[PDB]
Amino acid sequence: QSQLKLLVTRGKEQGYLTYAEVNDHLPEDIVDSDQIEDIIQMINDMGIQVMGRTTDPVRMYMREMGTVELLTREGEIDIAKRIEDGINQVQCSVAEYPEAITYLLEQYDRVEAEEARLSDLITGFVDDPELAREKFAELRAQYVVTRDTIKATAQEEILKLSEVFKQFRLVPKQFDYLVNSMRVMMDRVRTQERLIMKLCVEQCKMPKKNFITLFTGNETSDTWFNAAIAMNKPWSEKLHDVSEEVHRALQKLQQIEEETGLTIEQVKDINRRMSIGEAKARRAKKEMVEANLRLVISIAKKYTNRGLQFLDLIQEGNIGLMKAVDKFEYRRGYKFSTYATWWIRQAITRSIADQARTIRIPVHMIETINKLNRISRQMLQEMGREPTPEELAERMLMPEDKIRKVLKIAKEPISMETPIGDDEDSHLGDFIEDTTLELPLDSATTESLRAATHDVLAGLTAREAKVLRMRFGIDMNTDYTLEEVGKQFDVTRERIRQIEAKALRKLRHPSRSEVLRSFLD
Amino acid sequence: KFWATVESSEHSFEVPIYAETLDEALELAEWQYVPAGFEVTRVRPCVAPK
Amino acid sequence: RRRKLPATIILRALNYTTEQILDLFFEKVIFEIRDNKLQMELVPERLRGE
């Protein structure tokens, strides 16, 4: 029951505290400068020092993942089941979209027309170029049979269309683009819907209760528009003012029913269904990862000192675990533990191979270095001192002259702030000389040489000076070709080339040449 | 306020102690000083002709 | 240089109950209730400085 005594007690038992900790606990009556700055002196006379949540995320992450309940052998099957139920739902949602099929057919029309490759359009269906060329025709056939049924008999063929479209394993990029296209189309639908909506409720003064009444099921026709406004309602006669805008913007709304080959009613349903599926999927998968977060740490504890931080390792490893959850199928019976282990380890190793170096080197380089490091172990005490630098790669399958270069670039650069001898503020980089700088003496000699050469060029004839300056970059930008010189000089060719040699001779004699001679040091 | 003269260690100094009475100022000083191992020497009222 | 702890802890960590600790650094003054209203065993040297 004292504030000060608490401050000093912490600062006595520990002995040792920081400015902030002292500022945290201060007498009720001390808020100001001399009332603290002196209290420090008071404290720094006895027990002298001056300078839950522990911060460092190594803790917080460990605790936050420490919450998550470990799975059960059967629970994994539950979650994976939720996954299966989730995904293939959005796959079916894709298969029920006409533009999704037509896009595939058109892109394949581009494939056979040599405007693109197969690898970009497919990974193979349930599995050959010929088999592909045929199976694709099967798909096209099941499309062209359902295309003419648009007239209650079509719901039967649409099933089989979905079936054959589902048999295709699309390139992930393409599938992504398809889903994107669908959702974007939905966003357009919402553009028109909201535009029409705000011209009634937000402007024209009319309830959303009555607005959606005749809206659902048509929205394209004038049943809710031309057959409505005459109804003698308080919100009815107000609809005349904007009646132009809505009717003009309705065209695109019914145009979507053409482009997508689906009524506005159906579109929203399909895309919403797909959203539900996707959400379900991710919802299960995350839950799968969070349970296995421990394995990642257990693996990462091996790779600690390789030049990456602990949390970096566990995060890259977490990404690996995510990949494992994405590519895993419980139907194969493979234990998820021993499976995902390799994935996490792979992500870790592959990442360390990359970002642990100031100068990043290719993977095969790292491996090639590793092998040499291993060979140099066995011959260490075997040779009595160490194997000669030119005896390593003999056992390696390469020209063997690499050992030098490989041993050279591999060494990491030394910290420029590394303390050098004398233990003073002297640091390594402080002794790094600037070579790229042009010393002032030389920079002066250059100016003097400019003036000198100018003077020597002032002695020749006007045309000799002009042509000799033109042959070089003297007092001009971009020294000109011997033909160009003539082009500017009128008379051309072998003429100019002569004057050059005629100038040099006149400047060769130790009268005009003696001045700049000493520059030849 | 009241300036309380506290002396400890190698040297001394005065710290402001707010209170409604000289006696109260002394009590609030000691309660907020003595237990830390700091000696309470003097207590003075703040003058300041105004 | 670590944080301060009560000395007796280092004894308890050596597996010594409170009795054993008190049975080391302190002598014993025996009290007898023989007959009634106690009594005390007295070593004449104990009376020094009191």
From Swiss-Prot, chain A:
Family, as annotated: Belongs to the sigma-70 factor family. RpoD/SigA subfamily.
Region Interaction with anti-sigma factors, residue ranges: 493-508
Keyword annotations of the record: Cytoplasm, DNA-binding, Sigma factor, Transcription, Transcription regulation
UniProt subcellular location: Cytoplasm
Domain notes: Contains 4 domains, connected by flexible linkers. In the active conformation, the domains are in an extended conformation, each making extensive interactions with the RNA polymerase catalytic core. In the autoinhibited state, sigma-70 factor domain-1 packs closely together with sigma-70 factor domains-2 and -4, contrary to the extended conformation that is seen when the protein is part of the RNA polymerase holoenzyme.
SUPFAM superfamilies according to UniProt: Sigma2 domain of RNA polymerase sigma factors, Sigma3 and sigma4 domains of RNA polymerase sigma factors
Organism (species): Escherichia coli (strain K12)
Subunit and partners: Interacts transiently with the RNA polymerase catalytic core formed by RpoA, RpoB, RpoC and RpoZ (2 alpha, 1 beta, 1 beta' and 1 omega subunit) to form the RNA polymerase holoenzyme that can initiate transcription. Identified in a complex containing RpoD, the RNA polymerase subunits RpoA, RpoB and RpoZ, CRP and DNA. Interacts with Rsd; this prevents interaction with the RNA polymerase catalytic core and with promoter DNA, and as a consequence, promotes transcription from promoters that require alternative sigma factors. (Microbial infection) Interacts with Escherichia phage lambda antitermination protein Q.
Function: Sigma factors are initiation factors that promote the attachment of RNA polymerase to specific initiation sites and are then released. This sigma factor is the primary sigma factor during exponential growth. Preferentially transcribes genes associated with fast growth, such as ribosomal operons, other protein-synthesis related genes, rRNA- and tRNA-encoding genes and prfB.
Name used for this protein in its record: RNA polymerase sigma factor RpoD
Interaction with anti-sigma factors (site feature) positions: 471
Curated annotation (Swiss-Prot), chain B:
Record bears the keyword DNA-binding: no
Keywords tagged on the record: Bacterial host gene expression shutoff by virus, Bacterial host transcription shutoff by virus, Host gene expression shutoff by virus, Host-virus interaction
Subunit structure of this chain's protein: Interacts with host RpoC; this interaction inhibits host RNA polymerase activity.
Species classification: Viruses, Duplodnaviria, Heunggongvirae, Uroviricota, Caudoviricetes
Name listed for the protein in its UniProt record: Bacterial RNA polymerase inhibitor
Annotated coiled-coil segments of the chain: none
BP terms from Gene Ontology: symbiont-mediated suppression of host gene expression; symbiont-mediated suppression of host transcription
First-to-last residue of the parent protein present: 15 to 64 of 64
Lineage: superkingdom: Viruses
Entry function: Acts as an inhibitor of bacterial RNA polymerase by interacting with RpoC subunit and thus preventing promoter recognition by RpoE. Non-DNA-binding transcription factor that plays a role in the transcriptional switch that abolishes transcription of the viral early genes (class I) by the host RNA polymerase but allows transcription of late genes (class II and class III) by T7 RNA polymerase.
